[PDB]
Design a protein around this ligand. Structure first.
Ligand SMILES: [Mg+2]
Lengths: 245, 79, 158, 51, 190, 42, 51, 107, 258, 59
RNA sequence: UGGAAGUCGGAAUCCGCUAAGGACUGUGUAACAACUCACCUGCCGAAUGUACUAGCCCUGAAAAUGGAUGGCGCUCAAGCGU
């Protein structure tokens, strides 16, 4: 096969991880297992998940693992022969999709209360349902796209105009300002980014993120926890509903 | 290029006797010169060439290595 | 009654830090002379050092504060001789600072640190000091960081 | 109005320093930004210095 | 290496009729009817499943096996054209001289015709004739926009390319003279 | 409908699969066994 | 390239030379009185060449 | 126009609406174009192209080797001779060239 | 680009002098506890060494500063040791003898004023009096046709000797910096020069494998010293004038006597 | 000195650090130190420019 | 440095949180912002990637009247290897 795509060589500092990262994750989980009384499994599905840094900073006494799902499952032990502790294989059935492990010494009611009172407004990802209709008004395009009043808003940067055109907004540059149609807002209707009830695609979510419009929330759903003293797993509300494997 | 619509002068593949004889003489002179240079060559050469070995995709390379171990052990026991 | 927060970089003991600040605080109704005077009064502790100044603006008056940064704290703890900024340039911070002072700087910077403990905080301060170019205890901050990992040096907890 | 980021004293000192270049020439000091601050609103000793 | 058997599958929607005879593929749907002659490519067509068309190559080389993906994509594009259609939105922009675009339909030939005037003040009238089956309309929602819609993706995209290439700026700095008609959006009618 | 964006803008293009004309000749478990045997041989 | 983009200044003609500190309205005055396209921005040293 | 007027025009009005995608498509076509140039150029132009491509390949391989090996004077001279451009500096009374080609008197 | 001050007893750095943009090629320590540095950034700097602070910065040279020399280096090298071959009994008497030798060598018009000559790669020297003239040089020493490698005051402070890459050693007045005479005879660039204790003779060691002893009052080649098989890198004359030591690329020390 | 001034200036400042996209030159080289010296220098320069002009006109 | 916040430069290039993220790969700003790459996670699904070697093919330099595998012509050959 002489006709082939030429692989780019990256002259960058960070290399691929490989098997040693998997072994390090194995060792970290197997060394944090005996130190903690409870192990929660939590799910964050179709979310940006950059607030897990804030979650880790708030729960400084706890250990949070957010690695590969199958790697964490093999670290815990899928079968009772290979499990590290008594009953962790009963916890491994929750590990499907985007999951995380939470080793803690706090009270389970305290953990549930914290993750029930945790509230955060986050940008929507593709596939979510739009809660409301967003429309950029005609005229000068501002930074927020009409969410705040234009008197309190600032004009959008002129470097975003090719990106808006690529994402589908029919904007144009007038004397250094990005405008939708005419500078006086004539001969052009407003641009509807999304409609209510419409499943958002990545183009629409990128437009909403560039206009700083948040249409989702960051929720951490606890599926179930394992106690070292009892040796059994307790099923929670999201655990009874979510599929298992 | 506009080769199809306006081709240029063809390149003849028909040889001439003079060029054939000259090429044969130069080939003979070159092989004699290579023999002389190989004789006079001061480049180091090993007594035993580097053998490439057994290919990895040969499915019985493991059994060949077993046979080599067994033969060397038998030769050491006999000697 | 809206509160606005403006972060800028200023040199201690200089009034000219308002030169790049006046075009944006002018429409806000702030007097650049008194803003620079307040900035100099807040940064009189930090003479000759590039520090971060926070301005809190509400009802057209500004309250000044100095946000502590690891680089400024390390350079202040180096205790270099006083110098003229305009005449003496291309200096190097090559003096020595003690590990106890490093731990105190880490305790000061704990409000910004995301690390779990003072060991990680002291290691961050040691990395910042290594970037600055100074020595710790007459040795390299990288070497002392490696010693803290290997366990020869004990960092107190809290 | 000193919204340029530089003091009126600094502006007058710059004018006095570059005054020797203005020999055999025609000098007009234009006070700009009169919509912000008028000349009558100044300190009278500033006004005396400009005068 | 000659591969003994290779195959591809094309699903067909419920409201779509496909008829293949002598590698002449006819696809009919709600929006119309399209034809394509694929007799230049060696392929065996079959009905492997209800609503699935199978494409087979026997004792073919890597090139012959790879051609089946192109055949699959071509037939899928015909199916998408007769089901949802194809739509290209173009924008014309100008600095000083406003570009005048007039769209008419020739009654004798049945094709649309686009006339472009005042391109950078030029006195010539540019005339571009669309492929049959392609409709051009001046948009009313947006400013200075044409919409080209049809069932044939190749015809729609080629008509857009002809309109784009007829307004070429010559012997001027293209960093400074930004005038022209460009394809701004590609998608489906439905 | 498709949620991701295609780089060249041809949104009608189907979700293509990898061009593997030799797909299906050998199974995964047999290849794992051959991996183990080749590692031991090496 | 810089010489090709240099402006043409006649040194022996009628000339109004505008000078001062940054951010005092020099480019605004020149834009008001002439047709020259010099930028007006609130930061210092917006104008980095002779216009 | 004066000073950086093309940059000012790019700030005020942008570029052509198809410039980014056409540049991306041309950069994507560079591989086919380079293969076509390698297989279709003729004569001295082809020879210079092949030599200059050989030089590019050698330089690229050196750069890749240096990026792999990122994670791993000779003669004693005094202080006043340091940081200067110094030479590398590497019975039978025979000359270096004992025998050359003889020249006949008609030559 | 730094100069570090060490305490010898503890090995600890007391001050770091930084501010140079190039390598600091030469450092001297005067008797007023001022440290003089010359660097490859075309600069000669004076520092107060008690405070570790920059007092003066001269940027008159056009290329690398190769060497600097003080008017009192001969007595600062030897302290209280002199021709009497006897030392004072106590440390206070030794320090007083060293201070009075330094003051006698450094008096200019009745006051102690150290003079500094800087030899650079811009084919020139500069003469500085920071006490009386400050940042204005006393004179610019011109006349070398190539880079000047070494420069040295005479022990009596009346003459300045400079060795150049133009195969020559030149003599200058140490007061006003005017050119006096040229010592010609080397055929390769002259690397080092050294004065005798009585300021009659200067020995120059060059790249041409030789040392040459010059009588400066007659301006003539007094003695020629061949014997080195390669280039000469270091030349010293003893403080009592008994011996001359030379060393270089031939890996052997050569001591020369009368 | 004249045979080496050009090489000396190039060694002191290379061409790429003087003008171009990667230039680091911030302070120019001036034949005057003060404003009074600049005024006198400009007057002498105008006189010399004029005198060269009449000499070229006469030639 | 007038300004320089990874991205005009010079030199250093460490630590935390880590699943992983360079004292930064490019676009960008006056400077910021913003975007992007390295790296990581989720979806999918079974074979791939790099570098060399051997065959055949193209290029690897050509002038001047119109012409030559001997000519027609030949393409799973009427070419090449056995
Ligand atoms: Mg301005």
């Amino acid at each position: 096969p002489k006709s082939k795509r030429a692989r780019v060589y990256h002259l960058t500092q960070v290399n691929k991880k490989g098997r040693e990262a998997k072994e390090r994750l194995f060792s970290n989980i197997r060394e944090t297992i005996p130190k903690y009384q409870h192990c929660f499994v939590f799910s964050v599905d179709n979310m940006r998940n950059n607030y897990l840094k804030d979650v880790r900073h708030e729960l400084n006494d706890c250990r949070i693992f957010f690695g590969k799902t199958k790697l964490m499952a093999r670290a815990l032990g899928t079968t009772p022969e290979e499990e590290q502790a008594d009953g962790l294989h009963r916890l491994t059935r929750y590990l499907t999709g985007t999951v995380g492990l939470l080793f803690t010494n706090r009270d389970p009611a305290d953990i549930e209360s914290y993750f029930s009172n945790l509230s955060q407004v986050d940008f929507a990802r593709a596939g979510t349902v739009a809660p409301r209709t967003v429309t950029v008004p005609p005229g000068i395009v501002y930074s927020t796209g009409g969410e705040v009043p234009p008197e309190h808003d600032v004009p959008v940067s002129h470097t975003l105009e090719p990106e808006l055109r690529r994402l589908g907004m029919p904007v144009r540059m007038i004397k250094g300002k990005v405008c939708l149609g005419d500078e006086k807002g004539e001969a052009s209707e407003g641009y509807t980014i999304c409609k209510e009830g419409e499943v958002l695609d990545s183009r629409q979510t990128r437009l909403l993120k560039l206009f700083s419009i948040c249409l989702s929330e960051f929720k951490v759903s606890l599926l179930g926890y394992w106690s070292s003293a009892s040796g059994e797993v307790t099923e929670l509300e999201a655990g009874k509903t979510r599929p298992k494997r | 290029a506009g080769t199809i619509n306006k081709p240029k002068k063809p390149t003849s593949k028909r040889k001439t006797t003079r060029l054939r004889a000259k090429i044969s003489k130069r080939a003979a002179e070159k092989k004699r010169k290579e023999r002389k240079l190989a004789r006079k060559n001061p480049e180091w050469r090993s007594k035993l060439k580097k053998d490439p070995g057994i290919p990895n995709l040969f499915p019985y390379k493991e059994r060949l290595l077993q046979q080599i171990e067994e033969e060397r052990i038998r030769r050491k026991e006999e000697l | 009654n809206e509160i606005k927060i403006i972060h800028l970089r200023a040199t201690g003991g200089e009034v000219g830090a308002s030169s790049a600040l006046a075009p944006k605080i002018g429409p806000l109704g702030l007097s650049p002379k008194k803003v620079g005077e307040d900035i100099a009064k807040a940064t009189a502790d930090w003479k000759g050092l590039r520090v971060t100044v926070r301005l809190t603006i509400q009802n057209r008056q500004a309250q000044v504060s100095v946000v502590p940064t690891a680089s400024a704290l390390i350079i202040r703890a180096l205790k270099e001789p006083p110098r003229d900024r305009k005449k003496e340039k291309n200096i190097k911070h090559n003096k020595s600072v003690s590990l106890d002072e490093i731990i105190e700087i880490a305790r000061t910077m704990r409000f910004k640190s995301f690390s779990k403990d003072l060991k990680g905080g002291v290691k961050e301060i040691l990395g910042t000091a290594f970037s600055v170019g100074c020595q710790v205890d007459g040795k390299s901050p990288k070497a002392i960081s490696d010693a803290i990992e290997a366990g020869e040096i004990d960092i107190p907890d809290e | 109005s000193e919204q340029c980021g530089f003091s009126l004293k600094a502006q007058i000192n710059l004018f006095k320093s570059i005054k020797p270049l203005f020999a055999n020439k025609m000098v007009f000091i234009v006070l700009n930004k009169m919509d912000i601050k008028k000349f009558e609103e100044l300190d009278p000793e500033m006004q005396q210095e400009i005068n | 290496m000659r591969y003994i058997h290779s195959e591809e599958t094309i699903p067909v929607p419920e409201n779509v009729k496909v008829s293949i005879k002598s590698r002449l593929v006819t696809v009919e749907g709600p929006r119309g009817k399209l034809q394509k002659d694929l007799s230049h490519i060696a392929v065996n067509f079959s009905v492997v499943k209800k609503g699935v068309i199978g494409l087979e190559i026997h004792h073919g080389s890597r090139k012959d096996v790879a051609a089946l993906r192109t055949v699959r994509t071509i037939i899928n594009n015909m199916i998408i054209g007769v089901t949802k259609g194809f739509k290209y939105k173009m924008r014309y922009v100008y600095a000083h001289f406003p570009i005048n675009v007039n769209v008419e339909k020739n009654a004798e030939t049945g094709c649309y015709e686009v006339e472009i005037r005042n391109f950078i003040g030029e006195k010539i009238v540019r005339k571009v004739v669309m492929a049959p089956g392609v409709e051009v309309e001046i948009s009313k929602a947006q400013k200075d926009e044409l919409i080209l819609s049809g069932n044939s993706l190749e015809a729609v995209s080629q008509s857009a390319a002809d309109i784009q290439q007829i307004c070429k700026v010559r012997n001027k700095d293209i960093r400074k003279f930004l005038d022209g008609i460009y394809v701004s959006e590609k998608g489906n009618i439905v | 409908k498709n949620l991701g964006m295609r780089k060249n803008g041809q949104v009608w293009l189907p979700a293509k699969k990898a061009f593997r004309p030799t797909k299906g000749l050998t199974s995964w478990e047999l290849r794992v066994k051959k991996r183990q045997e080749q590692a031991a041989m090496k | 390239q810089h010489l090709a983009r240099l402006p043409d200044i006649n040194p022996t003609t009628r000339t109004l030379l505008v000078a001062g500190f940054p951010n005092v309205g020099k480019s605004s005055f020149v834009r008001s009185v002439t047709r020259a396209d010099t930028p007006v921005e609130p930061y210092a040293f917006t104008t980095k060449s002779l216009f | 126009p004066q000073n950086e007027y093309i940059e000012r025009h790019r700030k005020l009005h942008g570029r052509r609406l198809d410039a980014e995608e056409r540049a991306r498509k041309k950069a994507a076509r560079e591989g086919h174009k380079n293969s076509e140039n390698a297989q279709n150029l003729r004569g001295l132009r082809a020879k210079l192209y092949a030599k200059q491509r050989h030089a590019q390949k050698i330089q690229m391989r050196k750069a890749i080797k240096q990026h792999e090996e990122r994670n791993v004077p000779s003669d004693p001279i005094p202080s006043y001779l340091l940081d200067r451009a110094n030479p590398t500096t590497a019975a039978r009374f025979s000359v270096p060239i004992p025998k050359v080609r003889g020249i006949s008197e008609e030559e | 680009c730094t100069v570090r001050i060490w305490l010898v007893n503890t090995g600890r750095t007391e001050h770091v002098l930084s501010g140079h943009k190039g390598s600091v090629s030469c450092v001297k320590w005067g008797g007023t506890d001022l440290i003089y540095t010359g660097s490859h950034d075309r600069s000669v700097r004076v520092w107060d060494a008690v405070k570790g602070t920059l007092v003066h910065n001269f940027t008159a040279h056009g290329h690398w500063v190769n060497h600097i020399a003080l008017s009192s280096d001969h007595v600062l090298r030897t302290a209280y040791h002199d021709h009497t071959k006897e030392v004072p009994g106590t440390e206070e008497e030794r320090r007083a003898k060293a201070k009075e030798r330094f003051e006698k060598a450094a008096k200019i018009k009745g006051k102690v004023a150290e003079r500094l000559v800087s030899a650079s790669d811009d084919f020139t020297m500069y003469l500085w009096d920071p006490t009386n003239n400050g940042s204005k040089p006393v004179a610019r020493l011109l006349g070398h046709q190539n880079k000047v490698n070494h420069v040295q005051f005479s022990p009596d402070g009346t003459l300045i000797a400079s060795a150049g890459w133009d195969n020559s050693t030149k003599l200058w007045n140490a007061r006003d910096g005017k050119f006096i005479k040229n010592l010609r005879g080397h055929v390769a660039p002259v690397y080092q020069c050294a004065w005798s204790a009585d300021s009659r003779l200067v020995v120059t060691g060059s790249k041409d494998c030789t040392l040459k002893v010059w009588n400066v009052r007659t301006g003539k080649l007094a003695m020629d010293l061949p014997g080195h098989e390669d280039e000469v890198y270091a030349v010293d004359w003893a403080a009592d004038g008994e011996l001359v030591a030379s060393g270089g690329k031939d890996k052997a020390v050569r001591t020369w006597r009368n | 000195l004249k045979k080496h001034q050009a090489k000396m200036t190039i060694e002191r400042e290379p061409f790429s650090e003087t003008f171009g996209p990667k230039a680091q030159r911030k302070r120019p080289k001036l034949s005057f130190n003060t404003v009074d010296e600049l005024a006198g220098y400009s007057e002498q320069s105008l006189d010399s420019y004029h005198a060269r002009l009449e000499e070229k006109k006469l030639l």
